């Protein structure tokens, strides 16, 4: 190439008129911002390209029940709180469980939680609550539970059936500018492909029409396998694919563990992530760390870092220092 002449000038024009990262090649290591929100999984973190979800942008997390969406949502939230941040939770499902949130790192006490009466409301609240500039993150549990005021009151609206896609489009449009000027990232939980499921692949094509286009990031969270511990069902392994990422190349895979009541294993995430990058060395079942050993079985290894917090932070570091 010299072909690379006009092309690079072009792409400059694309990012010029249409948003920022409108065009890029799968193989890049983009700018890397200073403000991000770690997901709780370094694995996912790196797949997002920027070690956290983007700020001031809308984010769609979708997949089947019992996948890992809320957990992820709740972790992503526990952190906006560590850096002194205010988080809001718009609840249309009435299925949030504090004892679990808290167990993950979420200050439930200071966690704002609305319980909308119509979807048209839920969004109004979520908006004029955003136009504040006080919230760092806001989670909308269930995109489908936001029923229009007309379908819920039996009848009292316009342009009949197929309206809640309008309420979304018309609202998402307002939150866009609202979020792009306040630095509030929002997570929309979308309940219900994931490659490796099979049997068909559902019915009538939307990852939320509007949401599909508004979303800057879109996670495809699917449960890939339920875990064990020679005892029972400790948790399960989750697979997240980033089908959309306007902050860095998309289509990146991220896999991690989630344990009932515990959440995402940072430790277990560090091992499988530190070895693949030569930081950790498996041999004879010993996940030894440069000279000194960690544990016999990966579980016992998960536990080691769990006890040796100091050495675990040193691994998380080296890895994020090797890439981003
Ligand atoms: N109250 C809870 N107690 C124990 N584990 C829980 C609890 N809530 C969620 N989980 C864990 O999260 C997984 C499902 O994720 P979320 O609960 O993220 O569902 P979605 O995946 O959002 O339906 C479950 O398999 C379980 O391991």
Swiss-Prot record:
Compartment list: Cytoplasm
Loss of function: phenotype: Not essential in the absence of DNA damage, its deletion renders cells much more sensitive to DNA damaging agents such as UV light, ionizing radiation, alkylating agents and DNA gyrase inhibitors and desiccation-induced DSBs. 5-fold decrease in survival, loss of HR, no change in NHEJ (non-homologous end-joining) or single-strand annealing DSB repair.
Cross-referenced InterPro entries: AAA+_ATPase, DNA_recomb/repair_RecA, DNA_recomb/repair_RecA_CS, P-loop_NTPase, RecA-like_C, RecA-like_N, RecA_ATP-bd, RecA_C_sf
GO BP annotations listed: DNA recombination; DNA repair; SOS response
Pfam families hit by this protein: RecA (PF00154), RecA_C (PF21096)
Residues that bind ATP: 66-71, 97-100
Keywords: ATP-binding, Cytoplasm, DNA damage, DNA recombination, DNA repair, DNA-binding, Nucleotide-binding, SOS response
Residues where phosphate binds: 66-70, 191
Record bears the keyword DNA damage: yes
GO MF, one annotated term: ATP binding
Keyword Chloroplast: no
SS bond partners: none
Cellular component terms (Gene Ontology): cytosol
Family: Belongs to the RecA family.
Protein's job: Required for homologous recombination (HR) and the bypass of mutagenic DNA lesions (double strand breaks, DSB) by the SOS response. Can catalyze the hydrolysis of ATP in the presence of single-stranded DNA, the ATP-dependent uptake of single-stranded DNA by duplex DNA, and the ATP-dependent hybridization of homologous single-stranded DNAs. Numerous X-ray crystals have been resolved under different conditions which indicate the flexibility of the protein, essential to its function.
Subunit structure: Polymerizes non-specifically on ssDNA to form filaments. Interacts with and activates LexA leading to autocatalytic cleavage of LexA, which derepresses the SOS regulon and activates DNA repair.
Protein name: Protein RecA
Native species: Mycolicibacterium smegmatis (strain ATCC 700084 / mc(2)155) (Mycobacterium smegmatis)
Species classification: Bacteria, Bacillati, Actinomycetota, Actinomycetes, Mycobacteriales
């Amino acid at each position: 190439p010299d072909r690379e002449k006009a092309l690079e000038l072009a792409m400059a024009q694309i990012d010029k008129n249409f948003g920022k990262g409108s065009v890029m090649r799968l193989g890049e290591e983009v700018r890397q911002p200073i403000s991000v929100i770690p997901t709780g999984s370094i694995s996912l973190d790196v797949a997002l390209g920027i070690g956290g979800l983007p700020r001031g942008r809308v984010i769609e997390i979708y997949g089947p029940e019992s996948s890992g969406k809320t957990t992820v949502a709740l972790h992503a939230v526990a952190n906006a709180q560590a850096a002194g941040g205010i988080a809001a939770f718009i609840d249309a499902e009435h299925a949030l469980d504090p004892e679990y949130a808290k167990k993950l790192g979420v200050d439930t006490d200071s966690l704002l939680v609305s319980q909308p009466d119509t979807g048209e409301q839920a969004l109004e609240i979520a908006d004029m609550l955003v136009r504040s500039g006080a919230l760092d993150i806001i989670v909308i549990d269930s995109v489908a539970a936001l029923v229009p005021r007309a379908e819920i009151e039996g009848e009292m609206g316009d342009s009949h059936v197929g309206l809640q896609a309008r309420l979304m489009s018309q609202a998402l449009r307002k939150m866009t500018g609202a979020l792009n000027n306040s630095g509030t990232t929002a997570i929309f939980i979308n309940q219900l492909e994931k490659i490796g499921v099979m049997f068909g692949s559902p019915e009538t094509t939307t990852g939320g029409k509007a949401l599909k286009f508004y979303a800057s990031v879109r996670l495809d969270v699917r449960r890939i396998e339920t875990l064990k511990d020679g005892t029972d069902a400790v948790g399960n392994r989750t697979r997240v694919k980033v089908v959309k990422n306007k902050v860095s190349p998309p289509f990146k895979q991220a896999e991690f563990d989630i344990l009932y009541g515990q959440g995402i294993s940072r430790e277990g995430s560090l091992i499988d992530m530190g070895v693949e990058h030569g930081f950790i060395r498996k041999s004879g079942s010993w996940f030894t760390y440069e000279g000194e050993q960690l544990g016999q079985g990966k579980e016992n290894a998960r536990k080691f870092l769990l006890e040796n917090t100091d050495v675990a932070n040193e691994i998380e570091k080296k890895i994020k220092e090797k890439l981003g």
